[PDB]
Amino acid sequence: LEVRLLEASRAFEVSENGNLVVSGKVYQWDDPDPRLFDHPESPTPNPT
Amino acid sequence: LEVRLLEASRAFEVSENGNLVVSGKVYQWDDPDPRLFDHPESPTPNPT
Numbered sequence: 001l002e003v004r005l006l007e008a009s010r011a012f013e014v015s016e017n018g019n020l021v022v023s024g025k026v027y028q029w030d031d032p033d034p035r036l037f038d039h040p041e042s043p044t045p046n047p048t
Numbered sequence: 049l050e051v052r053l054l055e056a057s058r059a060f061e062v063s064e065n066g067n068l069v070v071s072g073k074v075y076q077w078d079d080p081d082p083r084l085f086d087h088p089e090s091p092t093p094n095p096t
Contacts, residue, residue, distance in 0.1 A: 006052055006061050008068040015056040023057060 002015045014022040062070040
């Protein structure tokens with residue numbers, strides 16, 4: 001698997017023998033926010 | 049100026065000091081059609 005990153009455009013590409021397999025975006029996170037991982041309000045508070 | 053090509057995705061990128069400048073797709077013309085360059089049917093011959 002060959003991986004290429006275009007840092008300026010925050011893009012990446014993965015190829016297998018010249019055939020595209022995965023494509024998208026990737027970039028480092030400047031200011032992580034721990035509250036992002038707080039568990040979301042469940043539909044049922046106390047199912048018990 | 050540095051030019052990076054993603055051959056699999058047929059995309060390129062031009063950057064200067066880590067800042068994006070140009071972006072788009074560039075690929076070879078497999079079977080050129082000479083008639084694409086014919087002058088398009090015009091409304092007036094413009095003889096005079």
